[PDB]
Design an enzyme around this catalytic site. Sequence first.
Site, short mmCIF file in Angstrom:
data_model
loop_
_atom_site.label_atom_id
_atom_site.label_comp_id
_atom_site.label_asym_id
_atom_site.label_seq_id
_atom_site.Cartn_x
_atom_site.Cartn_y
_atom_site.Cartn_z
N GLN A 18 0.82 -1.22 0.00
CA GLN A 18 0.00 0.00 0.00
C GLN A 18 0.85 1.27 0.00
N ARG A 21 2.11 1.89 -3.55
CA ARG A 21 1.06 2.50 -4.38
C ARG A 21 1.16 4.02 -4.37
N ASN A 41 -2.84 -17.30 5.07
CA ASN A 41 -3.11 -17.84 6.40
C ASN A 41 -4.46 -18.54 6.44
N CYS A 42 -5.47 -17.88 5.88
CA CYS A 42 -6.83 -18.35 6.03
C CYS A 42 -7.14 -19.55 5.14
N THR A 266 2.73 3.62 17.78
CA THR A 266 3.10 3.26 19.14
C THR A 266 3.46 4.52 19.92
N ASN A 267 3.88 4.35 21.17
CA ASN A 267 4.30 5.50 21.97
C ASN A 267 5.62 6.09 21.49
N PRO A 269 8.05 7.60 18.63
CA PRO A 269 7.99 8.28 17.33
C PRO A 269 8.58 7.43 16.21
N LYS A 426 -40.94 -7.94 4.73
CA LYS A 426 -40.41 -7.50 6.02
C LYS A 426 -39.30 -8.46 6.40
C1 LIG Z 1 -5.06 -21.31 10.18
C2 LIG Z 1 -5.57 -19.87 10.30
C3 LIG Z 1 -6.88 -19.56 9.78
C4 LIG Z 1 -7.35 -18.17 9.86
N1 LIG Z 1 -8.64 -17.87 9.36
C5 LIG Z 1 -9.10 -16.54 9.42
C6 LIG Z 1 -10.35 -16.20 8.91
O1 LIG Z 1 -11.15 -17.17 8.33
N2 LIG Z 1 -10.78 -14.92 8.98
C7 LIG Z 1 -9.94 -13.91 9.55
O2 LIG Z 1 -10.31 -12.61 9.49
N3 LIG Z 1 -8.69 -14.21 10.05
C8 LIG Z 1 -8.30 -15.53 9.98
N4 LIG Z 1 -7.01 -15.84 10.50
C9 LIG Z 1 -6.32 -14.75 11.17
C10 LIG Z 1 -5.24 -14.04 10.30
O3 LIG Z 1 -4.59 -14.70 9.56
C11 LIG Z 1 -4.59 -12.86 11.09
O4 LIG Z 1 -5.52 -12.02 11.76
C12 LIG Z 1 -3.62 -12.08 10.17
O5 LIG Z 1 -2.76 -12.96 9.48
C13 LIG Z 1 -2.86 -11.04 10.99
O6 LIG Z 1 -1.87 -10.38 10.26
P1 LIG Z 1 -0.44 -10.16 10.98
O7 LIG Z 1 0.49 -9.36 9.91
O8 LIG Z 1 -0.65 -9.46 12.26
O9 LIG Z 1 0.13 -11.66 11.34
P2 LIG Z 1 0.61 -12.81 10.23
O10 LIG Z 1 -0.18 -12.75 9.00
O11 LIG Z 1 0.56 -14.24 11.03
O12 LIG Z 1 2.12 -12.33 9.85
C14 LIG Z 1 3.05 -12.20 10.90
C15 LIG Z 1 4.45 -12.52 10.34
O13 LIG Z 1 5.52 -11.85 11.10
C16 LIG Z 1 6.60 -12.81 11.18
N5 LIG Z 1 7.41 -12.44 12.33
C17 LIG Z 1 7.03 -12.46 13.68
N6 LIG Z 1 8.12 -11.99 14.44
C18 LIG Z 1 9.17 -11.66 13.54
C19 LIG Z 1 10.46 -11.15 13.73
N7 LIG Z 1 10.94 -10.90 15.07
N8 LIG Z 1 11.23 -10.95 12.69
C20 LIG Z 1 10.80 -11.23 11.38
N9 LIG Z 1 9.51 -11.73 11.17
C21 LIG Z 1 8.74 -11.94 12.23
C22 LIG Z 1 5.95 -14.15 11.37
O14 LIG Z 1 6.82 -15.26 11.14
C23 LIG Z 1 4.80 -14.06 10.38
O15 LIG Z 1 5.08 -14.63 9.13
C24 LIG Z 1 -6.53 -17.13 10.44
C25 LIG Z 1 -5.19 -17.44 10.97
C26 LIG Z 1 -4.73 -18.81 10.88
C27 LIG Z 1 -3.32 -19.13 11.37
S1 LIG Z 2 -5.76 -14.71 6.48
C1 LIG Z 2 -6.56 -13.62 5.27
C2 LIG Z 2 -5.59 -12.47 4.96
N1 LIG Z 2 -4.20 -12.97 4.85
C3 LIG Z 2 -3.35 -12.35 3.86
O1 LIG Z 2 -3.75 -11.37 3.32
C4 LIG Z 2 -2.15 -13.17 3.33
C5 LIG Z 2 -0.99 -12.33 2.78
N2 LIG Z 2 -1.41 -11.09 2.11
C6 LIG Z 2 -0.40 -10.29 1.39
O2 LIG Z 2 0.73 -10.64 1.33
C7 LIG Z 2 -0.93 -9.06 0.62
O3 LIG Z 2 -2.25 -8.77 1.02
C8 LIG Z 2 -0.80 -9.30 -0.92
C9 LIG Z 2 -1.27 -10.73 -1.27
C10 LIG Z 2 0.66 -9.07 -1.33
C11 LIG Z 2 -1.71 -8.25 -1.61
O4 LIG Z 2 -1.43 -6.93 -1.16
P1 LIG Z 2 -2.48 -5.70 -1.53
O5 LIG Z 2 -3.78 -5.83 -0.54
O6 LIG Z 2 -1.78 -4.41 -1.37
O7 LIG Z 2 -3.11 -5.89 -3.07
P2 LIG Z 2 -2.23 -5.98 -4.49
O8 LIG Z 2 -1.22 -4.94 -4.55
O9 LIG Z 2 -1.61 -7.49 -4.66
O10 LIG Z 2 -3.37 -5.67 -5.68
C12 LIG Z 2 -4.45 -6.57 -5.88
C13 LIG Z 2 -5.70 -5.90 -6.51
O11 LIG Z 2 -6.38 -4.93 -5.58
C14 LIG Z 2 -6.19 -3.59 -6.13
N3 LIG Z 2 -5.83 -2.69 -5.01
C15 LIG Z 2 -5.05 -3.03 -3.81
N4 LIG Z 2 -4.98 -1.88 -3.00
C16 LIG Z 2 -5.70 -0.83 -3.66
C17 LIG Z 2 -5.95 0.51 -3.30
N5 LIG Z 2 -5.45 1.08 -2.05
N6 LIG Z 2 -6.73 1.34 -4.19
C18 LIG Z 2 -7.22 0.82 -5.41
N7 LIG Z 2 -6.97 -0.55 -5.77
C19 LIG Z 2 -6.22 -1.36 -4.91
C20 LIG Z 2 -5.05 -3.70 -7.10
O12 LIG Z 2 -4.85 -2.61 -7.95
C21 LIG Z 2 -5.38 -5.00 -7.73
O13 LIG Z 2 -6.37 -4.95 -8.72
P3 LIG Z 2 -6.14 -5.96 -10.02
O14 LIG Z 2 -7.20 -5.58 -11.23
O15 LIG Z 2 -6.38 -7.50 -9.49
O16 LIG Z 2 -4.76 -5.82 -10.50
CL LIG Z 3 -5.78 -15.93 2.95
#
Ligand SMILES: Cc1cc2nc3c(=O)[nH]c(=O)nc-3n(C[C@H](O)[C@H](O)[C@H](O)COP(=O)(O)OP(=O)(O)OC[C@H]3O[C@@H](n4cnc5c(N)ncnc54)[C@H](O)[C@@H]3O)c2cc1C
Ligand SMILES: *SCCNC(=O)CCNC(=O)[C@H](O)C(C)(C)COP(=O)(O)OP(=O)(O)OC[C@H]1O[C@@H](n2cnc3c(N)ncnc32)[C@H](O)[C@@H]1OP(=O)(O)O
Ligand SMILES: [Cl-]
EC number: 1.8.1.14
Lengths: 437, 437
Positions: A18, A21, A41-42, A266-267, A269, A426
Amino acid sequence: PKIVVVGAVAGGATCASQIRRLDKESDIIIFEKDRDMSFANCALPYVIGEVVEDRRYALAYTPEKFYDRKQITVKTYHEVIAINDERQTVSVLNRKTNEQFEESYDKLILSPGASANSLGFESDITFTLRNLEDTDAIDQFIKANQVDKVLVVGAGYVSLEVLENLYERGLHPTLIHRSDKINKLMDADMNQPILDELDKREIPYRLNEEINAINGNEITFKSGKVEHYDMIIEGVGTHPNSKFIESSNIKLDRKGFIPVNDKFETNVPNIYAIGDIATSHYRHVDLPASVPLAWGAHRAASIVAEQIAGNDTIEFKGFLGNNIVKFFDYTFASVGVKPNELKQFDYKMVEVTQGAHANYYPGNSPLHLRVYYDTSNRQILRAAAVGKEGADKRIDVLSMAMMNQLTVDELTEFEVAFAPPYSHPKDLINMIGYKAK
Amino acid sequence: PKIVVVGAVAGGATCASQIRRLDKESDIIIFEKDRDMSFANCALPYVIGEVVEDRRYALAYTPEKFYDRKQITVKTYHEVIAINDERQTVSVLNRKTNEQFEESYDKLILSPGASANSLGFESDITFTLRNLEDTDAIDQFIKANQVDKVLVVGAGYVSLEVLENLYERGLHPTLIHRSDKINKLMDADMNQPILDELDKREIPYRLNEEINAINGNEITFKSGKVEHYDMIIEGVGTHPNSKFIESSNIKLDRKGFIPVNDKFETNVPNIYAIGDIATSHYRHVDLPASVPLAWGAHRAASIVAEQIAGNDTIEFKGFLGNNIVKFFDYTFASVGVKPNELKQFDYKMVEVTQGAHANYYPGNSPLHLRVYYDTSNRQILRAAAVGKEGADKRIDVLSMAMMNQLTVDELTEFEVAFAPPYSHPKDLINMIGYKAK
Ligand SMILES: Cc1cc2nc3c(=O)[nH]c(=O)nc-3n(C[C@H](O)[C@H](O)[C@H](O)COP(=O)(O)OP(=O)(O)OC[C@H]3O[C@@H](n4cnc5c(N)ncnc54)[C@H](O)[C@@H]3O)c2cc1C
Ligand SMILES: *SCCNC(=O)CCNC(=O)[C@H](O)C(C)(C)COP(=O)(O)OP(=O)(O)OC[C@H]1O[C@@H](n2cnc3c(N)ncnc32)[C@H](O)[C@@H]1OP(=O)(O)O
Ligand SMILES: [Cl-]
Ligand SMILES: Cc1cc2nc3c(=O)[nH]c(=O)nc-3n(C[C@H](O)[C@H](O)[C@H](O)COP(=O)(O)OP(=O)(O)OC[C@H]3O[C@@H](n4cnc5c(N)ncnc54)[C@H](O)[C@@H]3O)c2cc1C
Ligand SMILES: *SCCNC(=O)CCNC(=O)[C@H](O)C(C)(C)COP(=O)(O)OP(=O)(O)OC[C@H]1O[C@@H](n2cnc3c(N)ncnc32)[C@H](O)[C@@H]1OP(=O)(O)O
Ligand SMILES: [Cl-]
Ligand SMILES: [Cl-]
Ligand SMILES: [Cl-]
Ligand SMILES: [Cl-]
Ligand SMILES: [Cl-]
Ligand SMILES: [Mg+2]
Ligand SMILES: [Mg+2]
């Protein structure tokens, strides 16, 4: 500004993306302690269930691809081990070489999330689920040992997803949980269909049950029961990944999370925290909130990007705690304060159970919608819905209502999209309003 | 007060019932010109398709049953032919005896609805669909004549539902429409799936086509084509049932509808109008609005009941125009001003096409969501969604947003219920907000 991000997944990779972007000039580096960035993750329970076959689905990016497309540097197997906040550097351990170095920053974004808790048994058959490495390990163990009988410990929504997936894969899970509070984000009485669905498929479960001892494949339980299991998946909670933060000036709460303001600062800067590690407040009531779910990680990622490289008047307005899980044929969704938090209010409850759509239209099923409101001001505090159809729709509508502190009475005014397959003239939501007087 | 109601269906019977909830003493009488009260208007196409086969779903009450349950008198086959508002009576024709009489009232509630338009041909094989008498006649004609080939005229939601149901019944319909403007409540460029679904099932259609001449079963068309059909169902619009009102002091607009205030009052003291016959205004913009759908009939029924026998501070806040139709595998939903009304505003359009739920999660289908906003104040003017999954959910959420004067930009703050089967961490609705600007 030079940007360093800790954690390369839901909060961290998203936030870096983001920022890019809005800003194509700043150097951005992400450190990730484990093997994979941007894993889904999910998706992981469904990967275990072989519902997601294409492993390409479980991984969105590699560091090389991320740099090719976004010019963001990601270093995997790099663990941040300390924050030297006064000099604005982080100490990073290269886990492959076991050599450490410092990386300077102008802005530091912490999204380290949480790790799975463990029961701590000395057992080669026990597994936790948090990342793709874990998923690979579970899959490999199932194949290597021809696993059939599996003990699923914990009845939280993720563990439930794991159980369903193991079942559909053809294995034979048994569920245990240390208390009777399964799927704890949902009203306790409305969780009954989870047990019904287990019973219907003759999947054994025992609540208020725990592991006492493990002797090879022989598991002894609190109840005194002894059973043989090929594998155990422990879903016994998570803990914040904040040990590396304790030596710094960053304020942690007593549980190890990082309180942040509405700019996700966080607290200290120049240091932000987002995702599961961060704590904030509710949008609709004046109470602390922690909502460790994906929506919040993504929303915070966007807000911090605006703070750093965009419109810095964009601030968080708080959480509602919208959450949902599917378990077999049923959907369980809720939003607002948690059940245990209702006691901080004077409240009343209104509920309806009605067909998800027109009664004469085939494939109908009873949908139970419940709404709690504050007696001091009629405002909606919490809503919950359970049913085979329509629960996600009603709860999303009510989330939108609460975002605007809508009152229960105004639900009579909600103009639903009605045709027979979808709702009623309704709607259930309207009926909550009519019944609130 | 003595209450007289004209029309015993969606507006009228509902309103009478709602009054009885509040007032057990007043005499209530409903006149209905046709055979049945409380027939299920919206179920009718599905009765034709033999999807709804239980008669008890086709109508809720007979007058005898309605009286036994609610002590409300309903006279079917009684047509109100004039309103004598200066003497506070209506003139009623008993259609069985062909004798007329006056009925006095203290309050009069008009819910006469609309009648189907006819092409005006002298054809025994041609039918329109508005009530249960019509539905019975169509079913009986199909059986009596072993109908196979049916011509469906018109491409509005009613006609489309009838077509689908004839197909599912095992018949062979052909769809024609006088123009290419099918399913007109939806954006013209978002209706392609209707044509795709027809093609996929090899159901013939011709646009820019009309019936030119009829000679028995031989139909000659505008295109010059000549075909034989067993039956014709004409869905060529409706007209207000207001001719009987013209001689009275009640103000009608030039199209024959009754403008009402927010209490559903006409210009004449003690006379209300509700349902399809009534015109009001939009809730979110200062423009006239008429929304001849069931939600509005039911909401007006409740408001009028409060006005007469309950809390008379309860008033209508205007329409949003939420509407929806299913056609085979697809859902088409929209809310807000009509496409033709957008020109009264300086506006911009934003849209997204994305899987209804997690891309890696099975049974996914592309959902197209479009939002128009006012550039002067960033307020949402119209939204439309088309897809196999999730369209009803997005449009209901946006209906609630518009009710709350949300700006398009605030859509980034909508906290969706996310798990893989349901949505995305940034929902389509969130993406609309992010893409705005
Ligand atoms: C199996 C599973 C199913 C889930 N299903 C859902 C769902 O259906 N709906 C929903 O809303 N949420 C779901 N979640 C929750 C979700 O994935 C989290 O809320 C989300 O990933 C949080 O983002 P995050 O960046 O805080 O943590 P994460 O996505 O877990 O990323 C944290 C990363 O930081 C890395 N890290 C930690 N400490 C350090 C360090 N000291 N140095 C370098 N790297 C480090 C870790 O290794 C990890 O890869 C699910 C989670 C799991 C595990
Ligand atoms: S456990 C459930 C959640 N877990 C996770 O999300 C797992 C890991 N996620 C990630 O690593 C990131 O979320 C990744 C997969 C890298 C995606 O990051 P972004 O959310 O920033 O999205 P992308 O850059 O990959 O773009 C995808 C499509 O969405 C449009 N888009 C993203 N952000 C914006 C904003 N701020 N404004 C307008 N459009 C935006 C992209 O342009 C894009 O559209 P396409 O037509 O598919 O290219
Ligand atoms: Cl996911
Ligand atoms: C086939 C079909 C499918 C539909 N599907 C949907 C849908 O999926 N979703 C949706 O929201 N809406 C749908 N509708 C629209 C819906 O039914 C109307 O919006 C609703 O019925 C309006 O209520 P009303 O009381 O104004 O008119 P009605 O329910 O049609 O009742 C009006 C009654 O007044 C009687 N009447 C008229 N004049 C006189 C008189 N002078 N004296 C005595 N009686 C009189 C009529 O005979 C009639 O029975 C559908 C309509 C049809 C016909
Ligand atoms: S085209 C789409 C719509 N179709 C039509 O409307 C067809 C014609 N409809 C009618 O003729 C009337 O709508 C009928 C069916 C005669 C009755 O109208 P009501 O809306 O009043 O429904 P009921 O009187 O039969 O009551 C049924 C259940 O709903 C509860 N309920 C109604 N109104 C309220 C209010 N204002 N407040 C709280 N609850 C209300 C009833 O108590 C009842 O619940 P039960 O499970 O039956 O005990
Ligand atoms: Cl330091
Ligand atoms: Cl703080
Ligand atoms: Cl109906
Ligand atoms: Cl008169
Ligand atoms: Cl798109
Ligand atoms: Mg006169
Ligand atoms: Mg795309």
